[PDB]
Amino acid sequence: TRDQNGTWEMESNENFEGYMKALDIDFATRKIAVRLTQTKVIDQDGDNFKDKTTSTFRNYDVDFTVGVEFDEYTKSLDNRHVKALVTWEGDVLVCVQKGEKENRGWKKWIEGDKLYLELTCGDQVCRQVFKKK
Amino acid sequence: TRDQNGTWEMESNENFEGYMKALDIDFATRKIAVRLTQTKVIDQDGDNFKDKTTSTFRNYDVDFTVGVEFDEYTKSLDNRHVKALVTWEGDVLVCVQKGEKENRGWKKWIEGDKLYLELTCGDQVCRQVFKKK
Amino acid sequence: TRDQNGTWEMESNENFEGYMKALDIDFATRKIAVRLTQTKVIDQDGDNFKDKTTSTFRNYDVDFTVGVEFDEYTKSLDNRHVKALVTWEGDVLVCVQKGEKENRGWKKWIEGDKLYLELTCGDQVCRQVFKKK
């Protein structure tokens, strides 16, 4: 329909890297620009268009079920096709990601009203705490 | 007018790349920092200052009417000057960008509740889909 | 209580750079990703998880009193430690940053309704202007 009025949120960006390569875009900006998602608001009027694009960092999404190994390609970091399996050790979520790096995984649990997530790769561990809001 | 209380939004950024170059800033981070705009909140009180800065992704605005050729500076891509002309090809909004690049343009249409935008340069095509939320 | 449904806001990110360095992550993304804070949205259903993490640009806060030397670690810029002292030069706020780079400092003042900020390092000068909202 000729009507494009409304606010539109990006759902998929396909071959944005290849499109930028055809535009003689250097490697530096391309790697960050792909990480981005945009939301378009399009005021229209017969033939007159006003299009406002706002850019934000993309949305990293991991969708899984406990106990089943699923193939997840981490497009938000190093795009590796790790086969991730998450298990319950009590009520704490421990995940092991089969890949090139050893002892690679993460742990997610809750303490009252704060969420603790520890990402582990080798001997290094990053501890993040989240507040519900 | 020593009083600096308020929230200030960045209006112009001059020679920020040169300033960063004197600070030994890497090339990739510099390219992102220019793409950014900042808003500074400055709680004050005689000599005491409390300063909060938020950096966000500038906003790309393209305003056109069908059938008129407008000058477009694609700042959020390859900073090139293209002469763009948009026409109606059925219910698909087709734009041709006459410039240094040959088959450069895009096609925009609506199919129910998703907005489809296909960006083309030469033989490469970027496929984006947007959902109205 | 294993229940992780809700929207969670990040409170602390510890050793995320060290975690990424073991992942062969690029300094460019690492410098930005550390500058980033994340928000996790976790709607669940028995064993099914959906986790959406979106990042945003850290804030960076400088709190000072005129005539008092404060220690400034220039985060989100060149990660350098400077001893900064700010003074009043007329109605212009002048700061001198003692560090590895010479002639480093900034001046910020107001002329009616715009906030002017001049960042100086060596021979390069960055001039920013802010409008009150």
Q: Give the DSSP letter string of chain B.
A: -----EEEEEEEEESHHHHHHHTT--HHHHHHHHTEEEEEEEEEETTEEEEEEEEEE-EEEEEEETT--EEEEETTTT-EEEEEEEEEETTEEEEEEESSSSS-EEEEEE-SSEEEEEEEETTEEEEEEEEE-
Preferred mutation among A1, A3, A29, A41 to probe B, highest tally of B CBs within 10 A: A29
CB contact under 8 A, A31 and B28: yes
Burial of B50 (C-beta count, 10 Å sphere; 0-12/13-18/19+) = middle
Largest interatomic CA distance in chain B: 64
Residue whose pair of structure tokens reads 């026409």 in the numeric block = B87
Burial of C37 (C-beta count, 10 Å sphere; 0-12/13-18/19+) = middle
- Nearest C-alpha in A relative to C38: A130
- Nearest C-alpha in C relative to B38: C130
Q: Which pairing describes strands B70-74 and B80-89: parallel, antiparallel, or unpaired?
A: antiparallel
Cα angle C35, C39, C40 (rounded to 5 degrees) comes to 135
Cα angle A12, A54, B43 (rounded to 5 degrees) comes to 140
Cα angle C33, C37, C42 (rounded to 5 degrees) comes to 115
DSSP code per residue over C5-45: -EEEEEEEEESHHHHHHTTT--HHHHHHHHTEEEEEEEEEE
Compute the distance between CA of residue B39 and CA of residue B53 in angstroms, rounded to an integer. Answer: 6
Residue whose pair of structure tokens reads 């975690």 in the numeric block = C19
Burial of B60 (C-beta count, 10 Å sphere; 0-12/13-18/19+) = middle
Chain A nearest-CA distance from C80, in A, is 23
Length of chain B, please? Answer: 133
CB contact under 8 A, A131 and C8: yes
Compute the distance between CA of residue C105 and CA of residue C72 in angstroms, rounded to an integer. Answer: 12
Enumerate residues 6+ apart whose C-beta is below 8 A from C5. C42, C43, C44
CA B130 → CA A112, B112, C31, C50, distances in Å? 38, 11, 30, 21
Chain B nearest-CA distance from A84, in A, is 28
Overall number of domains in chain B: 1
Q: Which pairing describes strands C48-57 and C61-65: parallel, antiparallel, or unpaired?
A: unpaired
DSSP assignment letter at C98: E
Chain C residues in contact with B36 by the CB 8 A cut-off are 57
Burial of B29 (C-beta count, 10 Å sphere; 0-12/13-18/19+) = buried
- Nearest C-alpha in B relative to C118: B14
Domain span at residue C36 reads 1-133
Sheet containing A70-73: give its strands across. Answer: A59-65, C48-57, C36-45, C6-14, A124-132, A114-121, A104-110, A92-98, A81-89, A70-73
Q: What are phi and psi of A5, to 5 degrees?
A: -65, 140
The shortest CB-CB distance from B22 to any of C28, C91, C101 is to C101
Residue C31, by phi and psi: left (phi above 0), alpha (psi -120 to 50) or beta?
alpha
Chain A positions touching chain B (beta carbons under 8 Å): 1-4, 6-16, 18-26, 28-29, 31-32, 36, 38, 40, 42, 47-56
Q: How far is CA B109 from the centre of its chain?
A: 21
Compute the distance between CA of residue A30 and CA of residue B38 in angstroms, rounded to an integer. Answer: 22
Q: Which pairing describes strands B36-45 and B6-14: parallel, antiparallel, or unpaired?
A: antiparallel
- Nearest C-alpha in C relative to B18: C124
Compute the distance between CA of residue C99 and CA of residue C126 in angstroms, rounded to an integer. Answer: 18
CB contact under 8 A, A31 and C32: no
Quick one: CA torsion of A87, A89, A93, A97, rounded to 10 degrees?
Answer: -50
Q: What are phi and psi of C76, to 5 degrees?
A: 60, 25
Preferred mutation among A85, A132, A133 to probe C, highest tally of C CBs within 10 A: A132
CB contact under 8 A, A122 and C38: no
CB pairs below 8 Å between B and C: how many? 111
- Nearest C-alpha in A relative to C32: A32
Chain C residues in contact with B49 by the CB 8 A cut-off are 62-66, 86
Compute the distance between CA of residue A123 and CA of residue A21 in angstroms, rounded to an integer. Answer: 38
Asked if B53 and C59 count as a contact pair (C-beta separation under 8 A), the reply is yes
DSSP code per residue over chain A: -----EEEEEEEEESHHHHHHHTT--HHHHHHHHTEEEEEEEEEETTEEEEEEEEEE-EEEEEEETTS-EEEE-TTTT--EEEEEEEEETTEEEEEEESSSSSEEEEEEESSSEEEEEEEETTEEEEEEEEE-
The shortest CB-CB distance from C124 to any of B15, B32, B49 is to B15
CB contact under 8 A, C121 and B24: no
Compute the distance between CA of residue C64 and CA of residue B51 in angstroms, rounded to an integer. Answer: 9
Identity at B105, one-letter amino acid code: G
Asked if A60 and C54 count as a contact pair (C-beta separation under 8 A), the reply is yes
Q: For residue C9, what are its two tokens?
A: 């806001």
How far separated are the first and last CA of chain A, in Å rounded?
39
